[PDB]
Amino acid sequence: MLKKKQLTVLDLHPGAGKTRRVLPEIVREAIKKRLRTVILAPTRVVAAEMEEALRGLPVRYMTTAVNVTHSGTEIVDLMCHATFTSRLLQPIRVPNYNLNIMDEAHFTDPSSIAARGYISTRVEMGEAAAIFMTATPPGTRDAFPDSNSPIMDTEVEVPERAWSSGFDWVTDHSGKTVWFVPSVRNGNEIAACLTKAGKRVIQLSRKTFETEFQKTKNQEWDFVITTDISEMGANFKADRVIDSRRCLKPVILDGERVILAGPMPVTHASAAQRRGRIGRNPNKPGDEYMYGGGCAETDEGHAHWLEARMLLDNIYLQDGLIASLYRPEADKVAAIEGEFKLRTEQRKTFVELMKRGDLPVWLAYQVASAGITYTDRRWCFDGTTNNTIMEDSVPAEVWTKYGEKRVLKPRWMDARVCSDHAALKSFKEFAAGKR
Numbered sequence: 001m002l003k004k005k006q007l008t009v010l011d012l013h014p015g016a017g018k019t020r021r022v023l024p025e026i027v028r029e030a031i032k033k034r035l036r037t038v039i040l041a042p043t044r045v046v047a048a049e050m051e052e053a054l055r056g057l058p059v060r061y062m063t064t065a066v067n068v069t070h071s072g073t074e075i076v077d078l079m080c081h082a083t084f085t086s087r088l089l090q091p092i093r094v095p096n097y098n099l100n101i102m103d104e105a106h107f108t109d110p111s112s113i114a115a116r117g118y119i120s121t122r123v124e125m126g127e128a129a130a131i132f133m134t135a136t137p138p139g140t141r142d143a144f145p146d147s148n149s150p151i152m153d154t155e156v157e158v159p160e161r162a163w164s165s166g167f168d169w170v171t172d173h174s175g176k177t178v179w180f181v182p183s184v185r186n187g188n189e190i191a192a193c194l195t196k197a198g199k200r201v202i203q204l205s206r207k208t209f210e211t212e213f214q215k216t217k218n219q220e221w222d223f224v225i226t227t228d229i230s231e232m233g234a235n236f237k238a239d240r241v242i243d244s245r246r247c248l249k250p251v252i253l254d255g256e257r258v259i260l261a262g263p264m265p266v267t268h269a270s271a272a273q274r275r276g277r278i279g280r281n282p283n284k285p286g287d288e289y290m291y292g293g294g295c296a297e298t299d300e301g302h303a304h305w306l307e308a309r310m311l312l313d314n315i316y317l318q319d320g321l322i323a324s325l326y327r328p329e330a331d332k333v334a335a336i337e338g339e340f341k342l343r344t345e346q347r348k349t350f351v352e353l354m355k356r357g358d359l360p361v362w363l364a365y366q367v368a369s370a371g372i373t374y375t376d377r378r379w380c381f382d383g384t385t386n387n388t389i390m391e392d393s394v395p396a397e398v399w400t401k402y403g404e405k406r407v408l409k410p411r412w413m414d415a416r417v418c419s420d421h422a423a424l425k426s427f428k429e430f431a432a433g434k435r
């Protein structure tokens with residue numbers, strides 16, 4: 001596995017022991033062979049769980065999510081997928097790792113796709129080895145893989161709105177359920193309906209994951225309502241998954257705006273990972289998976305793969321060469337390699353808009369490529385009337401850094417900046433010059 005020029009896909013079924021059993025064995029062998037190694041965790045929560053499996057091994061944890069005193073002699077580093085891509089983009093030295101291990105390698109956020117593209121290109125060049133750990137590699141067509149214990153799979157109509165009757169099976173259950181919804185707003189409505197019915201509900205999404213996931217351990221709960229982020233190594237002690245089988249798809253229209261299309265069907269990989277939350281305990285057969293739609297290849301034309309090309313075009317590899325996407329997911333976007341390569345100063349603005357600005361990659365690219373500097377927010381107010389952002393069904397308004405009240409009407413509209421209350425609040429602060 002560890003020889004140069006090799007990329008191995010470790011595709012043992014969900015719960016088979018890739019993280020807690022196989023990963024320490026790989027790490028021990030890597031250290032014996034003096035291979036400078038990186039381990040990439042999808043989230044801070046998985047990074048903390050990996051420290052538990054790797055305890056006693058010399059690993060440098062490049063995150064505040066792990067409280068350990070390092071020795072300074074570690075040749076194995078562990079960091080998040082997004083941290084890896086971020087450090088590659090910045091004028092910071094990233095070692096040319098001999099062995100690159102990515103856990104939960106199916107993650108489809110732009111920084112994870114870009115990390116796979118960079119790593120697989122270094123392997124193709126003959127410079128490095130890599131191991132991608134996931135039960136569901138790109139292009140998998142099996143939504144029902146093996147499990148540690150038998151699962152009861154049932155196709156059933158799943159509510160996507162509050163209900164008063166006709167879904168008694170949802171609330172008659174006396175165990176713990178993990179319910180995958182397509183968006184934070186949709187989960188808020190289902191959670192309120194379950195709370196009104198006397199259930200204890202925890203809600204998880206990308207921005208709240210670290211804080212709220214700890215509630216699954218510290219308090220008794222009946223339901224967890226989560227977006228797709230829980231497909232990335234989130235472990236629950238549950239006996240049922242309810243799966244809408246739906247997700248939102250960011251889509252770039254006419255190369256000039258991004259909408260959140262759908263809800264539409266999930267891919268087979270996502271459905272398998274959502275089901276994969278249960279059936280993990282061989283002593284508890286009969287966990288239930290209730291699913292409310294079919295699968296489709298909704299990653300084709302999805303904006304994350306175009307955004308991954310924007311990130312890769314701006315990462316140095318060798319002279320003017322540019323890393324390609326990982327071959328099995330490269331047809332998901334139609335893009336010219338190098339078309340998003342920016343000059344030094346525009347690249348710095350692009351990076352800062354993503355890192356400090358917290359803007360989506362596509363939107364950060366429009367601003368930086370227009371020659372606008374990080375702190376110049378005039379573009380948040382000079383778009384067309386059709387770009388007016390709404391708050392409570394009237395135009396949203398902010399006080400600019402000049403002290404003037406203005407309607408929020410960005411030059412480029414990306415639906416992700418106002419898809420829920422928290423996102424709109426963050427974008428209003430950005431438009432006002434507050435970060």
Ligand SMILES: COc1ccc(CN2CCNCC2)cc1F
Pocket residue numbers: 060061062063064070083
């Ligand atoms: C123990 O070694 C490290 C710890 C933290 C960091 C910096 N972090 C990395 C993740 N994102 C913010 C800054 C680097 C390290 F080498």
